[PDB]
């Protein structure tokens, strides 16, 4: 069900980013980045999400910091930045 080009939790990029699909387990609540309450924070409302990304699907879109691979919209990383436009 996850794409082959899913971001791996153990990607070097993901380790650096502290990317996690499991937004409940995610450091987001601990980190409490400014923008919107941690519970709201995920790739879904991240400035850097790329839903245009080739091979994007239901729960699975791109992220600027994760080219070629797809993050899960539900997930979060330390770089999470509030959806502008
Ligand atoms: S930058 Fe945003 S979209 Fe990308 S992985 Fe982090 S939280 Fe998700």
Swiss-Prot record:
Entry annotated with the keyword Cell membrane: no
Subcellular location: Periplasm
Any GO molecular function: 4 iron, 4 sulfur cluster binding
Keyword set, alphabetical order: 4Fe-4S, Electron transport, Iron, Iron-sulfur, Metal-binding, Periplasm, Signal, Transport
Positions annotated to bind [4Fe-4S] cluster: 43, 46, 63, 77
Job of this protein: Specific class of high-redox-potential 4Fe-4S ferredoxins. Functions in anaerobic electron transport in most purple and in some other photosynthetic bacteria and in at least one genus (Paracoccus) of halophilic, denitrifying bacteria.
Protein name (Swiss-Prot/TrEMBL): High-potential iron-sulfur protein
């Amino acid at each position: 069900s996850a794409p082959a080009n899913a971001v791996a939790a153990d990607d070097a990029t993901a380790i650096a980013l502290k990317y996690n699909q499991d937004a409940t387990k995610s450091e987001r609540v601990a980190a409490a980045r400014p923008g919107l309450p941690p519970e709201e924070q995920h790739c879904a409302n991240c400035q850097f999400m790329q839903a245009d990304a080739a091979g994007a699907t239901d729960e699975w879109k791109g992220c600027q910091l994760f080219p070629g691979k797809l993050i899960n919209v539900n997930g979060w990383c330390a770089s999470w930045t509030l959806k502008a436009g």
